[PDB]
Symmetry: C4
């Protein structure tokens, strides 16, 4: 598998351009595993276009200067209101894999979420983190002792939160991967204990098939009880699931449609956030993902009831283009992009973003 | 007329790509008679885009595993909540014609709808069905006695329901077939008695022209009284017609716009379904059709008041690609497609689909 | 300028296709005069896309057979609920000019509307019409004598109604015509008295015509002529009130095929508010974008009594003289007949009562 | 830097065509500095498409002839209800630069707004104006004394209003300029004092960066007191900013989004105008800009609460193609374009425009 290996900073004009730039250096199967989505990708497009539904106001004479992007979540002080989403198999994008990403996230000054489907070991990722905060994202085994073992290993590594991803009990209908007969070109060491052999050579379909299908609210209770860490439930698009998760002992709600990689013909993730936030009613923090590309998207999420957002495909494409420094350039971009938005919207700090008026655009994308 | 004749299973990634595939092995005229619709096909596009007006939510920690697609309608146990739509002249798609389709439907474990405009005889279809359940779809004669005879032969053959299609008293404005000067290359044995001759060489316009124009609610009561079978009324897009039909003695409502092949500049069929379901108020079963291409569509139709859906074009395209095995592959695709959708929506059985919350998408297709 | 000249029937599958086909037989400048509209033609597209705002229902077991398309308007019995709209300089389309259209309209069995900016004389047109009804559409001279004379000539020739066109006091911003330096290649007998048209822009022609039309003008035309008067060009309900009050016997809802005010609604979208104001006081003619039987149906379900046909008939004339134009009318009649059968309508009155499905998603659905 | 120099009238069919025409005579970097906007320019498109949201009615038999376009604002009599927007660096478009634009505006008979980021000195512009009225647009220095001098200097030149442009406290995300590495090829003599060096070679990001970031309502107060002139606050899109501005001593409101060059993923300017006009409630005059390309636009804006509009890009494109004569030709087109719209909408004068009904188009651009 010919993953790129060059390490270098990159100029980011916008993150959209990074997709096509990455397509030229990443192998065809892996690239399309990363970039693609369910069906004909209408819900991926909806994730993007949802940002035009609520528009930002420039505000004038607001007595603002040098906006501050720092915030805090569950007692982590972070440099900007975003974190790194859990993403499988970073080796598809760059030879330095999750250790590359981890170094970038750490030196930038935010939180790394570690996928259970990582192609790096905890030891390898930890080398990249170099002390930096990490949250571990579990894809559950069917066997209870194996979940206890995985969670114990995650906690031993330093995780300060557990992310239960529950929107992938079976795979999405990912046409590109089907058409490409995509299989993983390397192992997944954290979960291989419950796979039939090694992830190498398996389809995602069958790896999710090995994970737990019959997730119930008791799993949230049990993960909380066992780990003693705050538990996020990830993949929420319906507000009743945020109330269920909280009542089952969740410490955070992670609004997401898995980057449109899961259920097809579903809403753009952003359009779901306000009802979710209204139901959460500030009981616990909210992480939002699925389609964040610009500082304006960071701002709009917060104004709509998120505390932080999670970043995904653009960081991975930066990773492809420049290893840890390319991924860092993308994080840096987002920080600067937000800073501009903060200044022009009249926002001095992060809490101010959460209070912004939004202009309703009933005409949608074509205006 | 060089119809395809190969029999084989086929890979279905999505049903949409089956159209272009079928186009390369079906003669130009018949292919376009199958794919085409009225006018510039805006209402066919509407049938497809309607599915984006109501969007599915993924649901989490639902305690669902191995969902069951099995259901029952008018006492028939079927393997999934879909049945075969009545479609004329399957020999246009495949040399094995309706006998091929029958075998696929029967082997799969659902209901075959026999079109009065079949190019195959009752016994030739019965061959392929091998004992499997069948519903007969009447295009009425003007002559009362010819209707009684057609119903008698249908019932004698084993029909357990009669379907009256009443949205075709004259033909739609099918631009492709006008431009191609399409005429049928074979005969229609069941309705031949009222054609003045044979369907071979006749336009569809003139075949519809020979059937009954002055259909009335008495026709429904007469068919129910004579056959002694439950009667569906097919073609309904307005709720008042549902009230009419039930009052006239129908045992089922079949919501359909005939694949957009009849009235032009009409709504997408799915958009008309909630109003008709509300009016029906569970008094009889509802079959929905016109635009079903995905398991998501099956789920949405049920969530919106349908009890089952009927499949059309994609099963025909499958028949063209690999005979009965080809059509079978299509049925199997829909079954697996729906199973995924059930798992991700939190539906353990088919009844749970009927209670799903849908997200309203007032932006429509471009979002 | 050489207009086509061939006469023949045509196979009309839809009217949209006739635009491109005609483009291949009409000289460029003239064809684009016929086909073009103001600005980037956004409002002409709006006229066409408005039809998807209200959708028809198929209706079943309606006990209907052999629908009847015939109707009546201000005493004239017609074979279908449409008439020919007034259009200028038909010789741009076909050598046989307004006489060819006349004959088509006449044999088909509906009413012809005569433009004052016609290229043919009353007499040339009357031979075409062969005993058939006609409405004269006036563009007003700034001088009263000339209006009296035109009106008498028009009633002398046989006009049974008068159409006041009031939406063209100055021209639309027609970019095609400006880019093409388009000028009329021949003359308009009926109005040259206030100008020859040959070699002048439409801007300067409208320039000569009356800019300060007022409600008085409608009273006067009714008075002088003693014939039922239509006010043509209306898109706002208040002008329907203004009109009826000044003695109009009919409202003609229209935006001039989008050849006039730009960035305005599609014409069909304006129709309900106007019909509601009119409150069946006088008959309503509707135009600006009818292309299908479905459109005739929707306009009638929406408060119109008949529609007027424009572009497609003229494309039909380009292609095949009188016989082509006739094929288009025959198309519309048979197209309407299908829609009636599928919608559950036995007759034209049934069309005016159809329920329509509201589509708030618009054209892309 | 190869600015065009030809001086000639031009036959404007529509303003949109001027952009491509100008692109062939203006140097690449400059041209794209002028034409471009923030991000993917979605908000520049929204500026343009907002015009289709409210549609004009033709009105008949209105007894109207020879519409009068002239109007009055803050005691200037002007020939049509539009003025010239303050735009930096006309030298990017034409060697005659701001003196050329000035002559056109002066001869047409309206007001010139002078950008603090002019490439021409007050004297050069004054020569072109030849006694014509002028408003000066300030980009604030951070140093108080220096603002006093700038305003003293503008007042001495004959400014009869000051325009505070407050939506540019930092630059928009102008991807064209980033990608072209645009820097100014000449100086800005008026603001040299606070760049402490030439603008030549500097980016717009660093120029804005030198102007004042922390603009507060007190700045508006201090400018109105020190200058004794009516102050406009420019860049307003939210109704609260209009309240704030009038409260702080402003004598006019200027609704603008900087032609989409500033905050991205914001509304189209016109959609913001009614709510601002309702809040202002005729207390001061309103100038509207950002996307006016047609006479129909000027009408719609006045019908929506504007007193006059400000014209930007189309005028500069004219200047590129014809120096002062080409710019003049643009002003002349607008005036005739408006005149046609007055006649057909039944508007005898400018006040009549302000009373026009508009048709609400909820279907937006695609209809
Ligand atoms: C290539 C890829 C791999 C992913 N793998 C995982 C995973 O292992 N675990 C998980 O919880 N989410 C995973 N996600 C979803 C991300 O956590 C996140 O929801 C998504 O990337 C947000 O969408 P965006 O990148 O389009 O903005 C993955 C997403 C991508 C694109
Ligand atoms: C090629 C073709 C032939 C059809 N023939 C019949 C028929 O003979 N009888 C009938 O009731 N409906 C007929 N229909 C309508 C089908 O019952 C069904 O309503 C339609 O196929 C649903 O649209 P879809 O197939 O695009 O989903 C036909 C449809 C197609 C495409
Ligand atoms: C080429 C052309 C010339 C026209 N000339 C006139 C005219 O002289 N007087 C008039 O009242 N309307 C005129 N109209 C407007 C028509 O009466 C009618 O309102 C228009 O054709 C409706 O649009 P449609 O043909 O696109 O359906 C003209 C239209 C066209 C296309
Ligand atoms: C090249 C260019 C330079 C501009 N420079 C300035 C400026 O120096 N000061 C300012 O207040 N506005 C400036 N603007 C904004 C204009 O004042 C005005 O808001 C804008 O041109 C209106 O948008 P439109 O030209 O697309 O109609 C500029 C706009 C452009 C395109």
């Amino acid at each position: 598998y010919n993953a790129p290996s060059e390490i270098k900073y990159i100029d980011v004009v916008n993150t959209y351009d990074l997709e096509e730039e990455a397509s030229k250096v990443v192998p065809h199967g892996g690239f399309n595993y990363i970039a693609g989505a369910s069906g004909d990708e209408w819900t991926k497009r909806a994730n993007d276009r949802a940002w035009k539904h609520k528009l930002l106001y420039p505000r004038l004479a607001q007595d603002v200067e040098a906006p501050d992007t720092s915030t805090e979540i569950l007692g982590h002080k972070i440099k900007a209101p975003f974190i790194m989403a859990p993403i499988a198999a970073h080796g598809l994008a760059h030879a330095t894999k999750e250790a590359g990403t981890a170094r970038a996230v750490s030196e930038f000054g935010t939180i790394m979420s570690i996928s259970a489907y990582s192609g790096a070991t905890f030891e390898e990722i930890s080398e990249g983190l170099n002390g930096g905060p990490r949250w571990f994202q579990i894809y559950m085994a069917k066997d209870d002792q194996q979940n206890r073992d995985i969670l114990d290993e995650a906690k031993g590594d330093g995780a300060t939160a557990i992310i239960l991803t529950a929107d992938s009990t079976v795979s999405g209908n990912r046409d590109r991967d089907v058409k490409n007969k995509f299989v993983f070109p390397f192992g997944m060491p954290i979960v291989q204990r419950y796979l039939r052999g090694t992830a190498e050579g398996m389809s995602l379909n069958n790896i999710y098939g090995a994970s737990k299908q019959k997730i119930s609210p008791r799993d949230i209770e049990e993960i909380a009880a066992h780990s003693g860490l705050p538990v996020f439930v990830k993949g929420i698009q319906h507000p009743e699931d945020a109330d269920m998760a909280i009542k089952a002992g969740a410490s955070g709600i992670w609004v997401s449609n898995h980057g449109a990689r899961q259920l097809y013909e579903a809403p753009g993730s952003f359009d779901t956030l306000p009802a979710i936030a209204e139901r959460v009613n500030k009981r616990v923090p909210i992480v939002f993902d699925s389609g964040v590309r610009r500082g304006e998207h960071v701002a709009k999420a917060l104004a709509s009831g998120a505390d932080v957002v999670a970043l995904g495909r653009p960081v991975l494409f930066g990773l492809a283009l420049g290893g840890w420094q390319g991924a860092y350039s993308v994080l840096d971009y987002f920080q600067k992009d937000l800073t501009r938005v903060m200044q022009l919207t009249g926002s001095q700090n992060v809490e101010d973003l959460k209070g912004l008026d939004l202009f309703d655009n009933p005409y949608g994308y074509e205006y």
